[PDB]
Amino acid sequence: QCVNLTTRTQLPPAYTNSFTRGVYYPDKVFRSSVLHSTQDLFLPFFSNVT
C-alpha cells in the first residue's frame, strides 16, 4: 500500500533576522493624506524567520 523511504540523518534548523514586513491596507476602501489606526492581524516590524 505504502513504501517507507526515510533517512536516519536529521539536522537542527536555524533562525535569521527579518526587517519590516506585514504592512497591508486594512480594508478595500481608499484614504488620502490621513493617518489611521487599526487593530487586526499584522506582523511586527522586527522579527525572525526560519
Partner: protein
Amino acid sequence: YRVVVLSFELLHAPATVCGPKKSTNLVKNKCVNFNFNGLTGTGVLTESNK
C-alpha cells in the same frame, strides 16, 4: 421540520450580491441623491482623478 437560515453581512466591503437590477441612469453634475451599490447618500457629483 426543514429549517434554512440566511446569514447576511453588511461589512464595509463592496457588495457582490444585490437586489434584482433596479438600475436607471447616471448624472454628470447635479445636486441629486444616489443609492450606488447599497451605499446611499445625497450630494452633487463631479469628475475627478484618483
